[PDB]
Write a protein that binds this ligand. Structure first.
Ligand SMILES: [Zn+2]
Ligand SMILES: [Zn+2]
Ligand SMILES: [Zn+2]
Ligand SMILES: [Zn+2]
Lengths: 678, 1289
RNA sequence: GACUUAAUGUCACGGUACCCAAUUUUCUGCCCCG
């Protein structure tokens, strides 16, 4: 016993304390660093005279360093790859330093195999499948088959079964082992014995187990990867696996409170897309019963709404969140620590919501979904008077190109991009021809749109029919918008007769609006600090906020209305503002100042209108882009004269059907939008 | 069908990349990022030579972009011929994709040709694109091309053999910084090529149509940017020296390794680098420093033997063998080689551990799923397009720093490891002619940061992108063009040094030293900016007015890379804005090429000689009208200016200038170099300052001790208070510091003062040999103080408790707990005050303006022998020894300086000092003094100690006196003990370090504990907890007058010969008899009367003349203490004033009776700053009595005698034996108005000598041998105090 | 002429070598017997 063995045994004690599941992560990050300090000191002392055991301990410590680095953003960080590369380069020296015991050769090949499996999962072109297959066959030749004592042998066996080599000799020891979880048993049955009944049973137990684990776990990623492989192999079980995994994800996500959040993991969207495709392929099959087909189209709408509820903030934005409201800050910190603890534990060991059919009479509801997997777009219509469901499909590529063209031209030449606006409206009318036919959307009905991602920015109410003298959509129907179906509620509070105005900016002038006497309450003011917003108390019938806006391009909880002494953000609206039950709100800021511009097809970014809807306001009327101030003053005066009249009448009267002769008046009319469903 | 010969000239350094074909390009990352650069191909093998070229497709894309812009300016027309909007889309089903895909927007216009273009007749745009040609996308013969771009070869003027890559390019590392954290995310590498020698390329363009020829010749001049540099397109008709120095550096390091002195090599490295600031004569005239008092040692560093000769002769020989490469390259090469060998050999330097390294990242390709997006952009018809040019100069307001990788770590051929070994020496970015350089990347990143602050919102920059970002910052930044700047200055930079401080021991940590290279302040760089657009923004005007300095407002351009220590604050001077109208004056822009490269002529041009079309711009908005200003840019950083008033000498060491500059000085103050712009050189006089890192660390220690955060051993992933204010390895700091500059240093005469110090051996009483040292501080006095002006900056977003912390740190610097510089325990650098300028924000003003007898009565029973006779017939001996035996108590739980503990005490004592006998404290800088040495040559005469004509006593004298008293009281070890050579009387036994017991040796290290004296006053590994200040004269008479004397002051003393320890140890037994003390008597009367006798009859080389002070003078001084227990404070207050009839001894002439002083404790203040408020008490008489009682009980407990009772009575110190002997040695007989006064004098050596005065038998012949007294009774007579020596007892 | 480009499509002026670390702790310019 020299001091090399004493220091190695101390470092091994520290690593065995770090491999314990009862340890919090903030202690693990210190324990691993102490152990690596001792071992790298021994290496700097005895550079090539080191035994194989210290090299094995260094490789294990670098595996722990690799699993303690959390991904930020949507990219695997380079620190993870650097840790796995250094561990491989350290254990290769113990492999090439021969003349040890056979047990130490077994241990070295086991550590090299698990580091290579993780590095092949992260990076593909650096560590390909052929190299991994050769290394794993070499590791299983040395006798790494003890399925009762180590679970890393189970991982090696299942990964080799996935890569395609025969493993029929080890099946009985694989099944009878009590370290294996149920996904590994289902993979073993399907890939070796070709038995689908036992695979079906073990996968059902796996999903019922997934109902209680957080979404930061490894098991979610592995399960969705198995369903993707089953769909690629043209099996007949991925249809039934996808729906159960979707149900488990819904029940697990239900537990969070009113602050709508979910953990970002990369295979969420492919799970919802495969569930949508499974229910759609069941629905297009012919059946003599029609009620089953109605139930399947309703299931499609439910999957779409459950995707559109939350918005999935990233990790660095969650770590940089401001500290206030010591109970809600406590809820957020509890959520974050639960997610990080589940992420590491996977690697160390192994009001009411309305029904979809609850709509007032004479209404028609249209849901949207953009399927990235098949590259298509689905529109789902519900009709209340006939009580029927239908759905149609369309393409979305050239629509995206025309929208990006209008975005660039607007951001340079705001009022002179009007011809590109007219071209975008004609393109919406050409790609989606179903909303002008009488079978899909009936004549004279009120339409509620629940859009998906880049359809949140398109003007759907100003589409033009693909004819010679085309008509607009707002000439026959009255349109309303909603971010998701979960934001709808009831009890439209029409209590008071109060009128309130607030105003902070003095660029576009509103003095003729300011001098009116209808703003007779003492709550009205023209300085507009945030505490002036948090002191309204008696639920006014109309509130009018007139200020500028500012958008945070990562965190939607930091988008602010530019009021006095710092403004008021999304989170402060959700925590502080109370007296707005059943209040029509008219914003003065445009939508382009409150949301950032999009650079991808998918975007989830909710403005302050959704926070005003969650506080309890009955409807926000806003501008989608920057209009002259005279139009906003005209809208506010028309709303004061008539609070019970619909917006599309005013859009038809003041020049909304003038796209042929004067595109500026058409630009100024169709900018206005109502974001609240009764 | 005629050909065109084209030249391409650069005006900035361009980029270079290696040539791969198409598929080997996809195998590499740097080649895929490095498209649209200049390509490099090798020649032969060995990868050392090759050639550079620019492809024709790159020039074709540049000309196509220029033609599109020119056709968009005139709405689709050029000289009356119209044109369609081309074609930029390719179908995949018919033909392949053209090997380079477009992501940006394309400009379009309303097509008014009304004839569809075909092969028969086509517009100029379709000819220049080459649609209706032959030879599409698979190459054939060079005919059947309507337009052809050939490759562009380097026009080398010495194309004789080959070009090396190291002779054209230079490697560099760029960066990407997060906006919130201030830290970098990733990095990447480029090759930058020289433009002064290798910047002309020559090619050939073939055209077969005139209809395109007019537009092509127009659009070759509109190209402004190629390969990363501004360009202009015209149409015409020593490794062997490194190897030798590396071998010699290995020889030097091996010699230093053999002499067991390796750690000096690091110091030596930077010493040689500092030699580039001097001439070569310092190695040829031997102007290096020498040992001031050497017999064998020589210098501390320049006289180490290397292969049988000294180091200075070795350096002279190495310079005599390498005269061809110059002096500067010689010094830099030898310093770099020494540092690299030291870093190789040291290896594990036990600093920050740093696993896992750092990350490169190049932007990933678009191989999956594609994007065939085509985005047309149409400007409106009556729009106006203009181009603005801003010219000016950039002036450094502080030192600056632009980082660079180490040379021999960035070689463009062969770039450069399981463990991580980070460097500790950093360099600055220079050009090839050794000129300073502000790179384009630093300016562009700073402009992006300030524009994101001014807009209020911006994105983080994404790299792998298919759609361009449409945030406002990116839209405005796609129109700004800058230009790299170089100075007209080539002098070498300065090296600035930094250490770390261990917070428990308050000493320096080993291996924590690092250094940077900084450039001078006052330098000027050129500055050009160009903006091409439709209207000039308000946010760019706000950033320009923020960077610009005027009267009152100073500049705020934080470029560079060490901003937390205040490095890289520039200002913008002499701005001029000019305007091009491109819709009417496009031909003059083409003719003058946009003044590219001629921007230096625009700064000196009058308004009359401007080119046609360029007008001055006069609608430039003022500072108090811009709304991005006053709301986002002005409240960002807030300034606090103040002035420190220091009333003590100030010493902040340099430690390299003491080894380079001549004068053999040990510790000298810190200086700077300042560039002036009236003339064009550095200023001849240098400027004294205290560095920014020093008072940054002062504020950090002051905050961390009150919050209690310095005790934590780890600071990664932390969110404590001092990691929020001062930052860590993950976040940048919120507080930025600048230097403290001396402002009143012109009303002094002889600003630097020489102060010399020595250590006194405890046994022999004289100076320990070869421990003399010197200091040269700045002369601070209590009536002429130093005034230092300083400044720091606070960021917006600070809470109330953090501002309370910073104001409490400022109040603690004002109160005097943190002295500046070195040697604070002996009184150097004590703050007397802080003044705050009236531009400071009002919250700091109110928060700083809101935080605004003892007698002992113990009388000692003196010795009976000088009290019974009272006729003065006895003669005593002047020095006696004290002997407590061997037991010393060593505590191993040492009190730390990490925090202010609650149970302990801290405060200050004000004391007054009164003289009972005359006092001599000499000013031993001036050896000639006051009396002329022309007459009686060799006669040393001195003056009293004075700083600026004010009589003072140094703090080191007071500290040594009280330390010797405390060590004799508390039974501590010998702190300063000379283990000298073998004592004689034949050669006797082992040396006198071996005569001493092992327990009384000095404390070395913190493992075996610390004695009470070393625990209170300090050691080499532990800072003390008491600080003694300088004493100022305040009252009383002065200048003891004597009649017949050339000054009326200035007594001439007797001889003072070295002490001989063979009188106390006169055999091989009879060990070291303890410490040595002197008695209190009036021998100065017999010196003063016999002046004429000793001015004659002695040799005047053995004598010393010095000024004296009379009895009755009052001095005043202060003692400051932190983290003390109750018994330590009690024993300290007892050791200051030990009662009536007890007094101390101080100064020169202690055997003759000079210098008996008495200290009275005037006041005692305490504070407990971890309470609710930082208060100050007064500590009345009862509490100090209880403290002294606690100290007395601790002393009884150490003695062990449990017979003495405990009670609330006054202590009697004479019940302990050694306290009784010590207080017998310090008893004054003439104070209680008794008529008796003793006679104290040495024997006079075998009479028939000079002073005998009677037949007294008081010679060393009779007191010497073992016949009148044996040896043991001599040691017994030396050991018992106040015993008579005539007659003997 | 090759080394050395492919042509109806190159935002690399698309990326600050950046972030943390008091040149200092200890020492009376002092002293009588061969
Ligand atoms: Zn054409
Ligand atoms: Zn951007
Ligand atoms: Zn901390
Ligand atoms: Zn000691």
């Amino acid at each position: 016993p020299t001091r090399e063995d004493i220091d190695r045994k101390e470092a091994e004690r520290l690593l065995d304390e770090a491999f314990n599941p009862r340890t919090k992560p903030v202690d693990r990050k210190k324990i691993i660093n102490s152990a690596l300090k001792i071992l790298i000191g021994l290496y700097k002392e005895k550079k090539d005279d080191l035994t194989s055991a210290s090299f094995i301990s260094i490789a294990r410590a670098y595996y722990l360093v690799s699993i303690t680095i959390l991904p930020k953003g949507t990219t695997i960080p380079e620190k993870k790859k650097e840790a796995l590369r250094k561990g491989i380069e350290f254990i290769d020296r113990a492999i090439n330093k021969f003349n040890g015991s056979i047990l130490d050769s077994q241990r070295a090949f086991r550590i090299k195999s698990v580091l290579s499996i993780e590095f092949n999962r992260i990076d593909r072109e650096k560590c390909d499948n052929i190299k991994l297959k050769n290394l794993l066959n070499e590791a299983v030749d040395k006798g790494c088959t003890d399925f009762d004592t180590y679970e890393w042998d189970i991982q090696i066996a299942i990964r080799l079964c996935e890569l395609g080599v025969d493993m029929e000799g080890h099946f009985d020891n694989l099944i009878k082992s009590n370290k294996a979880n149920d996904l590994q048993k289902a993979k073993a049955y399907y890939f070796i014995k070709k038995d689908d009944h036992k695979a079906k049973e073990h996968m059902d137990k796996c999903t019922a187990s997934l109902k209680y684990t957080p979404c930061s776990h490894r098991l979610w990623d592995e399960t969705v990867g198995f369903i993707e492989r089953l769909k690629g192999d043209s099996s007949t079980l991925w249809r039934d696996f996808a729906i159960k995994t979707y149900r488990s994800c819904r029940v697990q996500e239900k537990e969070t409170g009113t602050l709508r959040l979910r953990w970002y993991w990369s295979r969420h969207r492919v799970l919802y897309d495969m569930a949508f495709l499974a229910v759609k392929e069941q629905a297009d099959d012919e059946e003599p019963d029609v009620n089953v087909k109605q139930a399947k189209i309703k299931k499609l709408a439910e999957i779409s709404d459950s995707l559109k509820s939350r918005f999935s903030l990233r990790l660095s934005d969650m770590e940089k969140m401001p500290k206030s409201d010591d109970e809600s800050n406590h809820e957020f910190k509890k959520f974050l620590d639960k997610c990080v603890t589940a992420y590491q534990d996977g690697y160390v060991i192994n009001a009411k919501l309305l029904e979809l059919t609850q709509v007032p009479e004479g209404w028609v509801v249209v849901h949207f979904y953009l399927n990235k997997l098949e590259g298509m777009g689905n529109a789902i219509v519900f009709d209340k008077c006939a009580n029927s469901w239908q759905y149609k499909e369309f393409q979305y590529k050239e629509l995206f190109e025309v929208f990006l063209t209008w975005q660039a031209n607007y951001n340079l030449y705001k009022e002179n991009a009007a011809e590109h606006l007219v071209t975008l409206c004609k393109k919406i009318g050409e790609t989606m021809p179903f909303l002008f036919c009488d079978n899909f959307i009936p004549n004279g009905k009120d339409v509620l749109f629940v859009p998906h991602d880049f359809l949140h920015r398109l003007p759907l109410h100003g589409s033009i029919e693909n004819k010679t003298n085309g008509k607009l959509f707002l000439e026959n129907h009255s349109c309303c918008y909603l971010p998701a179906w979960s934001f709808a509620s009831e009890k439209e509070a029409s209590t008071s007769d109060e009128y309130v105005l607030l105003k902070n900016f003095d660029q576009g002038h509103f003095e003729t609006l300011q001098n009116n006497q209808i703003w007779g309450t003492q709550s009205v003011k023209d300085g507009a600090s945030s505490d002036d917003l948090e002191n309204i108390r008696n639920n006014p019938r109309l509130l009018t906020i007139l200020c500028h806006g500012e958008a945070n391009m990562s965190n939607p909880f930091r988008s602010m209305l530019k009021l006095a002494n710092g403004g008021i953000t999304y989170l402060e609206i959700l925590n502080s503002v109370k007296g707005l039950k059943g209040s029509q709100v008219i914003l003065g800021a445009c939508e382009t100042d409150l949301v950032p511009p999009l650079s991808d097809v998918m975007d989830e970014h909710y403005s302050v209108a959704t926070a005003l809807l969650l506080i309890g306001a009955a409807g926000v009327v806003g501008t989608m882009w920057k209009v002259r101030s005279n139009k906003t003053k005209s809208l506010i005066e028309w709303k004061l004269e008539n609070i019970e009249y619909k917006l599309n009448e005013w859009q038809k009267e003041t020049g909304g059907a003038a796209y042929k002769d004067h595109p500026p008046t058409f630009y100024r009319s169709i900018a206005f939008r109502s974001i609240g469903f009764p | 069908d005629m050909n065109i010969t084209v030249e391409l000239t650069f005006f900035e350094p361009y980029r270079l990349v290696e040539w791969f074909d198409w598929d080997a390009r996809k195998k590499s990352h740097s080649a895929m990022r490095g498209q649209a650069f200049a390509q490099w191909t090798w020649k032969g093998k060995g990868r050392t030579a090759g050639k550079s070229f620019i492809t024709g497709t790159l020039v074709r894309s540049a000309v196509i972009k220029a033609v599109e812009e020119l056709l968009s300016l005139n709405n689709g027309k050029w000289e009356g011929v119209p044109c369609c909007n081309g074609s930029f889309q390719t179908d995949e089903s018919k033909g392949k994709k053209p090997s380079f895909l477009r992501k940006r927007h394309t400009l379009q216009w309303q097509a008014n040709n009304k004839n569809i273009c075909d092969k028969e007749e086509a517009c100029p745009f379709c000819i220049l694109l080459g649609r209706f040609d032959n030879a599409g996308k698979v190459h054939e013969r060079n005919k059947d091309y309507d337009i052809h771009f050939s490759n562009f070869d380097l026009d080398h003027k010495q194309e004789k053999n080959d070009l090396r890559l190291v002779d054209i390019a230079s490697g560099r590392i760029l960066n990407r910084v997060d906006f919130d954290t201030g830290k970098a995310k990733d990095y990447f590498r480029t090759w930058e090529a020289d433009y002064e020698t290798y910047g002309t390329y020559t090619g050939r363009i073939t055209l077969r149509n005139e209809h395109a020829k007019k537009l092509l010749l127009a659009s070759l001049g509109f190209v402004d940017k190629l390969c990363g540099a501004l360009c202009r397109i015209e149409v015409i008709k020593s490794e062997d020296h490194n190897d030798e120095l590396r071998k010699q550096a290995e020889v030097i390091v091996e010699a230093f390794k053999q002499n067991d002195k390796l750690e000096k090599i690091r110091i030596l490295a930077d010493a040689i680098r500092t030699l580039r600031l001097h001439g070569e004569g310092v190695i040829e005239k031997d102007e290096l420093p020498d040992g001031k008092e050497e017999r064998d040692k020589g210098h501390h560093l320049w006289d180490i033997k290397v292969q049988g000769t000294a180091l200075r002769t070795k350096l002279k020989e190495l310079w005599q063998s390498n005269k061809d490469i110059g002096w500067r390259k010689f010094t830099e090469m030898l310093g770099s080689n020494l540092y690299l060998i030291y870093k190789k050999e040291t290896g594990g330097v036990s600093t920050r551990f740093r696993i896992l390294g750092d990350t490169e990242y190049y932007s990933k390709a678009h191989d999956s799923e594609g994007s065939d997006l085509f985005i047309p952009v149409t400007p409106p018809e009556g729009i106006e397009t203009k181009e603005w040019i801003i010219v000016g100069r950039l002036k450094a307001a502080t030192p600056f720093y632009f980082g660079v990788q180490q040379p021999s770590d960035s070689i463009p051929g062969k770039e450069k490891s399981l463990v991580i070994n980070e460097h500790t020496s950093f360099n600055i970015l220079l050009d090839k002619e050794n000129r300073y350089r502000i790179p384009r990347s630093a300016l562009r990143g700073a402009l992006r940061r300030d524009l994101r602050t001014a807009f209020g919102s911006g994105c983080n920059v994404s790299l792998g992108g298919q759609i361009l970002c449409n945030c406002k910052v990116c839209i405005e930044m796609r129109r700004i063009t800058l230009k790299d700047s170089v100075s007209d200055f080539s002098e070498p930079p300065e090296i600035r040094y930094r250490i770390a401080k261990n917070p428990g021991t308050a000493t320096v940590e080993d291996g924590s030293l690092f250094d940077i290279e900084v450039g001078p302040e006052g330098l000027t760089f050129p500055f050009v900016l160009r903006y091409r657009g439709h209207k000039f923004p308000e946010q760019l005007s706000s950033v320009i007015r923020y960077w610009e300095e005027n009267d009152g407002k100073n500049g705020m351009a934080w470029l560079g890379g060490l901003d937390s220590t205040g490095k890289g604050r520039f200002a913008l001077k002499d701005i001029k804005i000019f305007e091009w109208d491109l819709n009417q004056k496009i031909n003059e822009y083409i003719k003058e090429r946009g003044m590219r490269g001629k921007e230096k002529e625009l700064l000196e041009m009058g308004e009359s000689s401007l080119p046609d079309g360029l007008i001055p711009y006069k609608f430039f908005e003022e500072r108090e009208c811009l709304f991005p200003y006053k709301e986002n840019l002005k409240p960002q950083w807030s300034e606090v200016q103040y002035t420190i008033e220091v009333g003590s000498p100030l010493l902040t060491a340099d430690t390299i200038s003491a080894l380079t500059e001549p004068g053999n000085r040990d510790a000298i103050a810190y200086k700077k170099r300042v560039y002036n712009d009236g003339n064009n050189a550095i200023e001849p006089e240098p400027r004294f300052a205290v560095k920014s890192e020093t008072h940054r660390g002062i504020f950090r220690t002051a905050v961390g001790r009150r919050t209690g955060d310095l005790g934590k051993e780890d600071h990664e992933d932390c969110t404590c208070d001092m990691c929020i204010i001062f930052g860590n390895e993950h976040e940048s700091s919120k507080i930025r510091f600048e230097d403290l500059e001396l402002i009143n240093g012109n009303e002094f005469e002889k600003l630097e003062k020489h102060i010399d110090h020595v250590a006194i051996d405890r046994f022999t009483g004289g100076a320990l040999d070869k421990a003399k040292f010197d200091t040269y501080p700045l002369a601070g006095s209590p009536k002429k103080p130093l005034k230092l002006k300083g400044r720091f900056w606070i960021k917006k977003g600070f809470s109330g408790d953090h501002k309370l912390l910073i104001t409490t740190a400022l109040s603690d610097i004002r109160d005097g707990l943190y002295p500046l510089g070195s040697k604070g325990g002996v009184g150097y650098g004590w703050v007397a005050g802080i003044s705050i300028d009236d531009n400071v924000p009002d919250d700091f003003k109110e928060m700083i303006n809101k935080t605004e007898p003892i007698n002992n009565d113990y009388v000692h029973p003196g010795h009976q022998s000088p009290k019974q006779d009272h006729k003065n017939k006895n003669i005593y001996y002047p020095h006696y020894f004290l002997d407590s035996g061997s037991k010393v108590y060593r505590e191993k739980d040492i009190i730390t300086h990490e925090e202010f503990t609650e149970e302990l005490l801290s405060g200050k004592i004000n004391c007054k000092l009164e003289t009972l006998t005359p006092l001599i404290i000499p000013d031993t800088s001036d050896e000639n003094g006051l009396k002329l040495q022309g007459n009686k040559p060799g006669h040393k005469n001195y003056k009293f100690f004075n700083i600026n004509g004010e009589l003072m006593i140094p703090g080191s004298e007071l500290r040594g006196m009280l330390r010797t008293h405390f060590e004799a009281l508390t039974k501590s070890c010998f702190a300063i003990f000379g283990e000298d050579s073998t004592l004689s009387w034949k050669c006797a036994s082992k040396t006198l370090g071996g005569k001493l017991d092992k327990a009384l040796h000095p404390c070395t290290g913190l493992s075996d504990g610390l004695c009470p004296g070393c625990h209170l006053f300090g050691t080499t590994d532990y800072k003390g907890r008491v600080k003694f200040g300088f004493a100022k004269y305040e009252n009383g008479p002065e200048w003891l007058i004597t009649r017949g004397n050339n000054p009326e002051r200035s007594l001439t003393l007797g001889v003072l010969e070295s002490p001989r320890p063979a009188f106390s140890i006169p055999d091989d037994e009879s060990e070291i008899p303890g410490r040595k003390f002197y008695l209190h008597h009036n021998g100065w009367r017999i010196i003063r009367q016999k002046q004429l006798e000793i001015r004659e009859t002695v040799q005047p080389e053995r004598n010393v003349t010095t000024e004296v002070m009379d009895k009755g003078n009052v001095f005043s001084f202060d003692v400051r203490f932190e983290n003390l227990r109750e018994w330590e404070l009690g024993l300290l207050l007892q050791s200051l004033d030990p009662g009536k009839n007890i007094a101390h001894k101080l100064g020169k002439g202690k055997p003759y009776g000079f210098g008996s002083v008495k200290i009275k404790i005037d006041s005692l203040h305490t504070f407990k700053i971890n309470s609710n408020n930082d208060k100050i008490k007064r500590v009345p008489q009862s509490d100090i009595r209880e403290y002294i009682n606690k100290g007395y009980q601790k002393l009884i407990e150490w003695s062990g005698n449990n017979s003495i009772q405990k009670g609330n009575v006054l202590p009697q110190w004479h019940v302990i034996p050694h306290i009784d002997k010590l207080y017998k040695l310090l008893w004054v007989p003439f104070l209680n108005d008794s008529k008796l006064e003793p006679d104290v004098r040495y024997p006079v050596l075998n009479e028939e000598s000079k002073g005998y005065i009677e037949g007294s038998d008081y010679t060393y012949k009779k007191l010497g041998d073992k016949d009148n007294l044996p040896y043991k009774t001599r040691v017994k007579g030396l050991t018992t105090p106040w015993s008579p020596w005539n007659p003997f007892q």
